[PDB]
Amino acid sequence: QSEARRRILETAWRLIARRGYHNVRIHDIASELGTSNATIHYHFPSKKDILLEALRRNVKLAFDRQVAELHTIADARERLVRLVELQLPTPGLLRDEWSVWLQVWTESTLNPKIRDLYNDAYDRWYQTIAMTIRTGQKQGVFRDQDADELATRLSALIDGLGIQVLTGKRGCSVDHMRQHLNDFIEHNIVE
Amino acid sequence: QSEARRRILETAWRLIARRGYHNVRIHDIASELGTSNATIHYHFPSKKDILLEALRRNVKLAFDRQVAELHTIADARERLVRLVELQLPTPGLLRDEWSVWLQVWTESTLNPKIRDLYNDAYDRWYQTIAMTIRTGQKQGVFRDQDADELATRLSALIDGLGIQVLTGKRGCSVDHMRQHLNDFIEHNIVE
């Protein structure tokens, strides 16, 4: 019955994502599930553990989702395109993941455990970007530029465009972030 | 004696920037200044007004700072270089401004007043980016690409690189963000 652990985290994630980690009380979590404040504090002794474990659980889900989205795509350009696609804050789960990212970025600057966890996860996905570039390079489908300098650009761009979408910048949308990213690719990465 | 208003905001800014808006209590502000919780609530009836006005005050300061940094720089490339420079989270005030930005981005997704204020300020600086590109274009010092599509890229890049610096991504630093941005310029903007 560590099932109840998981319901607590799935609820916590969703509430942190939609209301803001700091506006969520443990009693908001219990209300949603019908358990007691005491139940929730048994599994997660503080609110910080709640964020840390919900985040760890989602970073696992996102990566699996990614692996299975790219299980066998031989073509290095389609891979990079779909990687880009997996990063768009489409309505629902991916939009929710972005919401947490934004929160995790400020917590990072204050919290070494959240900072560590966030850096491993980012680092892993960044290594995935660069690899795909080195692979696309070796096929001669991509230009021979420092793959790292390139993955840095590409991943910084995805993050900046994401913010523009989530903050409601005029004429931004998920549709427009996708066009933009695909153009950075066609014109700056592709041979 | 609306002087005390300003001390309250200068203190609030600094505390939100370094500890996180949600970890700051009104009594942390009063302690720092020696006024009462009651004094602070007279000028700012809620904690939200505190963030909204501190943010409004800093967005004015940042823009002035910018105007006077570019009062008369005829040369469209040096302008764009210095604009880039004004955006780096150098230790102290600029690092503090970034800290708030990151907080303002999540508050935006929940708070229409903070969202409005943040969009005007961003929009203003973005218009400044694009103008400088159109000006550099007209001098033939910059390539003729859609200035807006370009300013979007450039400003998304600055934001993504900023996050990497503040979150402590391996091998990132203010020095490296500057090199990177200057290269995006030399190679993607310059003729």
Give the resolution value in Å: 2.3
Q: What residue ranges do the domains of chain B occupy?
A: 1-191
Contacts of residue A100, defined as CB under 8 A and 6 or more positions apart, other chains included, come to: A13, A16, A17, A21, A54, A55, A58
How far is it, in rounded angstroms, from Cα A56 to Cα A22?
Answer: 18
How far is it, in rounded angstroms, from Cα B123 to Cα B117?
Answer: 10
A184 to chain B: which residues are within 8 Å by CB? Answer: 153
> Contact, A43 vs A5, CB < 8 A?
yes
Taking CA A87 as the corner, what is the angle to CA A150 and CA A84, rounded to the nearest 5 degrees? 50
> Contact, A150 vs A97, CB < 8 A?
no
How far is it, in rounded angstroms, from Cα B22 to Cα B48?
Answer: 10
Q: Where are the alpha helices (DSSP H) in chain B?
A: 3-19, 26-33, 37-43, 47-69, 76-86, 93-108, 112-138, 147-166, 174-188
Would you state the torsion angle of the CA atoms of residues B46, B32, B99, B72, taken in this order, to the nearest 10 degrees?
100
Phi-psi region of B34 (alpha: psi -120 to 50; beta: other; left: phi over 0): left
Rounded to whole angstroms, the maximal C-alpha distance in chain A is 59
The 10 Å CB-count burial string (b at 16+, else e) for B95-116 is bbbbbbbbbbbbbbbebeebbe
Handedness of CA B48, B49, B52, B58 (dihedral sign): negative
How far is it, in rounded angstroms, from Cα B103 to Cα B107?
Answer: 6
How far is it, in rounded angstroms, from Cα A154 to Cα A150?
Answer: 6
- Give the nearest partner residue to B160 out of A155, A170, A180, using CB atoms: A155
Taking CA B106 as the corner, what is the angle to CA B126 and CA A101, rounded to the nearest 5 degrees? 100
**Way the structure was solved:** X-ray
- Identify residue A151 by its one-letter amino acid code: A
Comparing C-alpha atoms, which of B103, B118, B39, B56 is closest to residue B8?
B39
Helix (H) or strand (E) holding A71: none
Structure token pair of residue A41: 């504090």
Q: Which fold has domain A1-191?
A: Tetracycline Repressor; domain 2 (1.10.357)
Give the distance from residue B156's alpha carbon to the nearest chain A alpha carbon, in angstroms: 4
Q: How many CB pairs under 8 A join A and B?
A: 106
Contacts of residue B125, defined as CB under 8 A and 6 or more positions apart, other chains included, come to: B63, B66, B155
Phi-psi region of A34 (alpha: psi -120 to 50; beta: other; left: phi over 0): left
Nearest CA in chain A to B149: A180
Rounded to 10 deg, the angle between the A93-108 and A3-19 helix axes is: 80
A180 to chain B: which residues are within 8 Å by CB? Answer: 149, 152-153
Residue A103 burial (C-beta neighbours within 10 Å; 0-12, 13-18, 19+): buried
> Contact, A131 vs A76, CB < 8 A?
no
Contact: A157, B160; criterion CB under 8 Å: yes
Q: Tell me the three-class secondary structure of B40-77, residue by residue.
A: HHHHCCCHHHHHHHHHHHHHHHHHHHHHHHCCCCCCHH
- Identify residue A92 by its one-letter amino acid code: G
Contact: B161, A161; criterion CB under 8 Å: no
Handedness of CA A72, A77, A80, A85 (dihedral sign): negative
How far is it, in rounded angstroms, from Cα B61 to Cα B6?
Answer: 13
How far is it, in rounded angstroms, from Cα A36 to Cα A4?
Answer: 12
A122 to chain B: which residues are within 8 Å by CB? Answer: 167, 169
Structure token pair of residue B20: 């996180």
